[PDB]
Amino acid sequence: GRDIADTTDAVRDPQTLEILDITPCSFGGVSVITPGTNTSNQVAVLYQNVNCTEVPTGSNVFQTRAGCLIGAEHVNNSYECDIPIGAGICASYQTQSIIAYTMSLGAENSVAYSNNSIA
Amino acid sequence: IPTNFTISVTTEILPVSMTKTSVDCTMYICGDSTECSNLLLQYGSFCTQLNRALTGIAVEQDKNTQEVFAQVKQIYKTPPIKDFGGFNFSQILPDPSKPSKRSFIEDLLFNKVTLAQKFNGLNVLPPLLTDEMIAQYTSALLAGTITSGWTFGAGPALQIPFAMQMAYRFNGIGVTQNVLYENQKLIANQFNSAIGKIQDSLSSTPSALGKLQDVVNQNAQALNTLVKQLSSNFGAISSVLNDILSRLDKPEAEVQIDRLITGRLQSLQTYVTQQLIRAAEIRASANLAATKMSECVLGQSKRVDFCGKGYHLMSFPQSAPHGVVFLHVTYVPAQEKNFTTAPAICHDGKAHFPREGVFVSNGTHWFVTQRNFYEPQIITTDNTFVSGNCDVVIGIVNNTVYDPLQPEL
Amino acid sequence: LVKQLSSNFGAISSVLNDILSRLDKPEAEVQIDRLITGRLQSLQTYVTQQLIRAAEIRASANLAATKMSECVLGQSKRVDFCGKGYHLMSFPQSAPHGVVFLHVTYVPAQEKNFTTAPAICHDGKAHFPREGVFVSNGTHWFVTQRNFYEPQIITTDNTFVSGNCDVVIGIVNNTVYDPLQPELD
Amino acid sequence: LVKQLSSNFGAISSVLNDILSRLDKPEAEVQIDRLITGRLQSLQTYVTQ
Numbered sequence: 001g002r003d004i005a006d007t008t009d010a011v012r013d014p015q016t017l018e019i020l021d022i023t024p025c026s027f028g029g030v031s032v033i034t035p036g037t038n039t040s041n042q043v044a045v046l047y048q049n050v051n052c053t054e055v056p057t058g059s060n061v062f063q064t065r066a067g068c069l070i071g072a073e074h075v076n077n078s079y080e081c082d083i084p085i086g087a088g089i090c091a092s093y094q095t096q097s098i099i100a101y102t103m104s105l106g107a108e109n110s111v112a113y114s115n116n117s118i119a
Numbered sequence: 120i121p122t123n124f125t126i127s128v129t130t131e132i133l134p135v136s137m138t139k140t141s142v143d144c145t146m147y148i149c150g151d152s153t154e155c156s157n158l159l160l161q162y163g164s165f166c167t168q169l170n171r172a173l174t175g176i177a178v179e180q181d182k183n184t185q186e187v188f189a190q191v192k193q194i195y196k197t198p199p200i201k202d203f204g205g206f207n208f209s210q211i212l213p214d215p216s217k218p219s220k221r222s223f224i225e226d227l228l229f230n231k232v233t234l235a236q237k238f239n240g241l242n243v244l245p246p247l248l249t250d251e252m253i254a255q256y257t258s259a260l261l262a263g264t265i266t267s268g269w270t271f272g273a274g275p276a277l278q279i280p281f282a283m284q285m286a287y288r289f290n291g292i293g294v295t296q297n298v299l300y301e302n303q304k305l306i307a308n309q310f311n312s313a314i315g316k317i318q319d320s321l322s323s324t325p326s327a328l329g330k331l332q333d334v335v336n337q338n339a340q341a342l343n344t345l346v347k348q349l350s351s352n353f354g355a356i357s358s359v360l361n362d363i364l365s366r367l368d369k370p371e372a373e374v375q376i377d378r379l380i381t382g383r384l385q386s387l388q389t390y391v392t393q394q395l396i397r398a399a400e401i402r403a404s405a406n407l408a409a410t411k412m413s414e415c416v417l418g419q420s421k422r423v424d425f426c427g428k429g430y431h432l433m434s435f436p437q438s439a440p441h442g443v444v445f446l447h448v449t450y451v452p453a454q455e456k457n458f459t460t461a462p463a464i465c466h467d468g469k470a471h472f473p474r475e476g477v478f479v480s481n482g483t484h485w486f487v488t489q490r491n492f493y494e495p496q497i498i499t500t501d502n503t504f505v506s507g508n509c510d511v512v513i514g515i516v517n518n519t520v521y522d523p524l525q526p527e528l
Numbered sequence: 529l530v531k532q533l534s535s536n537f538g539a540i541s542s543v544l545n546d547i548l549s550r551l552d553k554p555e556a557e558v559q560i561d562r563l564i565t566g567r568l569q570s571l572q573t574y575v576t577q578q579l580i581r582a583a584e585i586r587a588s589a590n591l592a593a594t595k596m597s598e599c600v601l602g603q604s605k606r607v608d609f610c611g612k613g614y615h616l617m618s619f620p621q622s623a624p625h626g627v628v629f630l631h632v633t634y635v636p637a638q639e640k641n642f643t644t645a646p647a648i649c650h651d652g653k654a655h656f657p658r659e660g661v662f663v664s665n666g667t668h669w670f671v672t673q674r675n676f677y678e679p680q681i682i683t684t685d686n687t688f689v690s691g692n693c694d695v696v697i698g699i700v701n702n703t704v705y706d707p708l709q710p711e712l713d
Numbered sequence: 714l715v716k717q718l719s720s721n722f723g724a725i726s727s728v729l730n731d732i733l734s735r736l737d738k739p740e741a742e743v744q745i746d747r748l749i750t751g752r753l754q755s756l757q758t759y760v761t762q
């Protein structure tokens with residue numbers, strides 16, 4: 001066979017004459033999420049664009065849109081972006097570990113709008 | 120001098136960001152071939168140079184988005200009672216019934232722009248801010264400008280009635296407050312219609328968002344081109360690295376592999392070089408968009424044709440896939456009338472000049488008018504001033520200046 | 529750029545003197561050509577990057593020059609062009625490879641809510657404020673400037689009249705104190 | 714860009730016809746490929762600038 005560009009993507013077996021599809025093994029970029037080494041030696045590792053079922057720990061494992069994040073503790077809180085990860089997710093170091101969270105866009109406010117009032 | 124006016128809304132489209140691509144240089148060139156990888160190392164840090172160049176711009180793409188948006192320290196909400204003096208913003212305000220919390224118009228923008236995925240060492244990184252987050256910033260800016268005018272762009276957000284806010288914006292273009300208040304229904308109606316017309320403009324005028332679609336198309340073409348180059352076979356016996364390795368001996372393969380490496384190095388270097396140049400173009404666009412955000416959303420600019428054609432009153436931002444859309448609200452004068460004029464009037468031997476206005480003639484009588492709207496008034500000492508005699512002004516005409524106080528004696 | 533000199537671009541060694549010392553003409557020529565191609569490409573890459581980076585700096589310099597002209601040599605009305613707040617002035621300071629601007633801006637504080645209206649009705653006429661806004665502290669109406677509360681008495685010298693009061697949405701009844709009355713009496 | 718054409722980028726001659734005339738097929742191919750690389754480099758340089 002052949003893909004839109006190149007590579008067979010499929011072959012016919014010479015003895016059974018069956019067709020097998022060939023999918024390249026999973027891969028992706030690996031990045032280290034760290035505070036300064038003059039602050040802490042604990043880091044978290046992100047495997048980019050992979051599933052949580054891949055990369056042969058538990059508890060400190062969170063799946064995000066950007067890939068599989070291992071070593072950071074996910075919380076339901078929000079803060080200013082510190083170490084940006086992607087898709088609204090970022091991490092920060094607090095004291096005694098690395099925390100993963102959805103970033104805040106700022107404090108909320110509501111203007112006391114009225115047809116007859118000004119400030 | 121115009122006796123009427125039209126409030127119109129124009130749409131401006133500006134790109135803000137690119138696709139945050141990344142490349143595994145070794146995987147692109149060598150893949151899983153150990154022999155090819157060892158040869159690649161002979162080219163030094165080339166592989167790292169490309170990684171850093173692409174990373175640089177990948178980061179820049181979030182910087183660009185953050186500069187255009189995130190111009191607010193607080194996220195402002197829209198009041199539960201939308202009494203804005205008759206001005207209907209329902210098409211630009213977020214629609215709560217949808218999970219994306221987008222405005223009606225924003226959905227049109229996202230639906231019109233169109234965004235095989237084989238991984239050969241090439242990949243794509245997500246934006247730091249999500250579409251929902253951008254919508255929240257857009258909504259904050261919009262809620263702010265509707266309820267607090269430009270005050271939120273300076274310090275604290277200070278509440279003001281929308282009708283009075285417009286009065287300031289009209290005054291800001293040289294048109295007195297009388298014009299708004301006495302025509303508020305007309306103005307609100309023209310505005311509401313002008314906004315509704317946006318839907319037709321975006322629905323038709325096919326595609327419309329050419330600028331944003333072109334950015335997407337260019338990035339997609341660049342990646343597709345880069346992939347296709349793998350098949351070129353740059354002087355080597357075979358485009359397939361495994362085919363060379365399985366057919367030739369070691370030193371025999373090395374001389375063929377070097378050719379594939381050389382060509383692939385050129386292909387990657389070319390791709391990155393172009394991305395750096397395109398990134399600069401987008402950065403400039405983002406800087407312009409950010410400039411406009413600050414000058415046309417957080418205030419009213421006096422820069423001609425910088426914020427739509429006509430006299431600028433206000434604008435509203437809307438999000439878009441890889442950019443920002445500005446809706447510019449401008450004042451354009453209409454229904455011109457021919458009047459006879461003069462630079463000054465000769466009274467009791469003294470030359471009278473108009474104060475914040477111009478002298479016009481009805482044919483039999485002279486009046487003071489404002490510019491950009493006729494609204495005439497009788498000539499008195501309150502709307503004129505005196506400087507010297509009447510023998511120095513060229514084109515000066517005769518007339519009486521009336522009742523400073525004489526009726527009250 | 530320097531580290532790339534040590535790279536052996538398909539040659540037997542990355543040291544030119546070594547190639548020249550150990551090989552004769554017909555063999556050295558080949559090894560040398562390999563290093564030339566590699567080094568030339570590395571240098572071309574360097575220059576290309578410098579040109580692109582230079583463009584970024586040029587744009588920054590153009591912005592800096594623009595800002596100095598508009599922020600230091602005058603007062604700008606461009607929002608957030610001179611930092612947050614209303615621009616008063618800017619003081620430049622030198623720096624190693626750039627310029628630093630200290631932007632002085634006016635930022636309003638400690639706001640209070642007042643009752644307002646677009647106009648006042650007096651003797652059937654619609655009175656509009658001149659260079660100010662009508663406010664009320666709950667019992668009395670005043671006219672003040674927009675950017676700093678200063679409640680002045682509403683008089684004929686602070687207002688102007690258009691037409692009647694049947695066309696204004698939020699007009700309120702009040703008295704405009706014509707300053708001539710006490711001068712006439 | 715034009716002057717770059719009159720250059721032997723490690724080649725025996727800047728002229729393709731001379732290469733084809735003087736060398737046989739398997740030898741000319743190498744010299745031609747060499748000029749192609751050099752001349753493409755010149756076009757890439759021109760366009761980049």
Ligand SMILES: *[C@@H]1O[C@H](CO)[C@@H](O)[C@H](O)[C@H]1NC(C)=O
Pocket residue numbers: 015016
């Ligand atoms: C090989 O030939 C045998 C018959 O001798 C047949 O049954 C079998 O399916 C063929 N293919 C394979 C994979 O054995």
Ligand SMILES: *[C@@H]1O[C@H](CO)[C@@H](O)[C@H](O)[C@H]1NC(C)=O
Pocket residue numbers: 038
């Ligand atoms: C490391 O952190 C300490 C905190 O007290 C600080 O004094 C020191 O200068 C820092 N060193 C470096 C290299 O940052």
Ligand SMILES: *[C@@H]1O[C@H](CO)[C@@H](O)[C@H](O)[C@H]1NC(C)=O
Pocket residue numbers: 050051052053063
């Ligand atoms: C991971 O694999 C499981 C298989 O059941 C699938 O349901 C899940 O959606 C996958 N997650 C991602 C991020 O691909």
Ligand SMILES: *[C@@H]1O[C@H](CO)[C@@H](O)[C@H](O)[C@H]1NC(C)=O
Pocket residue numbers: 075076
């Ligand atoms: C905190 O996040 C976890 C994620 O699994 C969730 O199960 C839990 O309910 C959240 N707690 C609160 C208070 O939202």
Ligand SMILES: *[C@@H]1O[C@H](CO)[C@@H](O)[C@H](O)[C@H]1NC(C)=O
Pocket residue numbers: 111112117641
């Ligand atoms: C003034 O605004 C504050 C903040 O919204 C509000 O709490 C207060 O009740 C308002 N006072 C009046 C008189 O509107």
Ligand SMILES: *[C@@H]1O[C@H](CO)[C@@H](O)[C@H](O)[C@H]1NC(C)=O
Pocket residue numbers: 122123124
């Ligand atoms: C201005 O034009 C509109 C139609 O566009 C009309 O309805 C309105 O009455 C006109 N106003 C004046 C003062 O003529």
Ligand SMILES: *[C@@H]1O[C@H](CO)[C@@H](O)[C@H](O)[C@H]1NC(C)=O
Pocket residue numbers: 207208209
């Ligand atoms: C705004 O326009 C929409 C159009 O569908 C209409 O349904 C809505 O009632 C209008 N709102 C106001 C306040 O006029």
Ligand SMILES: *[C@@H]1O[C@H](CO)[C@@H](O)[C@H](O)[C@H]1NC(C)=O
Pocket residue numbers: 455456457
């Ligand atoms: C003003 O005079 C010019 C003379 O050419 C004429 O064309 C124009 O229509 C007139 N405009 C009005 C409003 O009468």
Ligand SMILES: *[C@@H]1O[C@H](CO)[C@@H](O)[C@H](O)[C@H]1NC(C)=O
Pocket residue numbers: 481482483484
């Ligand atoms: C304005 O012009 C008309 C003729 O077009 C004239 O009848 C009228 O009296 C003039 N206005 C005044 C105040 O005289």
Ligand SMILES: *[C@@H]1O[C@H](CO)[C@@H](O)[C@H](O)[C@H]1NC(C)=O
Pocket residue numbers: 513514515
């Ligand atoms: C305008 O031009 C005409 C040309 O004949 C001249 O007679 C008239 O005096 C001029 N008026 C003014 C104010 O210059």
Ligand SMILES: *[C@@H]1O[C@H](CO)[C@@H](O)[C@H](O)[C@H]1NC(C)=O
Pocket residue numbers: 465517
């Ligand atoms: C204007 O008034 C003066 C008063 O002395 C008179 O002499 C002059 O002729 C008048 N001009 C015209 C055009 O009537």
Ligand SMILES: *[C@@H]1O[C@H](CO)[C@@H](O)[C@H](O)[C@H]1NC(C)=O
Pocket residue numbers: 665666667668679
């Ligand atoms: C403010 O309100 C008080 C009554 O609470 C009133 O007597 C006073 O005149 C008003 N205006 C000023 C400037 O105090």
Ligand SMILES: *[C@@H]1O[C@H](CO)[C@@H](O)[C@H](O)[C@H]1NC(C)=O
Pocket residue numbers: 115116697698699
């Ligand atoms: C303000 O809104 C109320 C209803 O909430 C309405 O009765 C009142 O007339 C409005 N006043 C003005 C000036 O719009």
Ligand SMILES: *[C@@H]1O[C@H](CO)[C@@H](O)[C@H](O)[C@H]1NC(C)=O
Pocket residue numbers: 700701
């Ligand atoms: C007071 O204001 C109301 C507003 O509806 C108006 O109807 C009424 O005539 C005004 N009172 C006087 C004496 O004008």
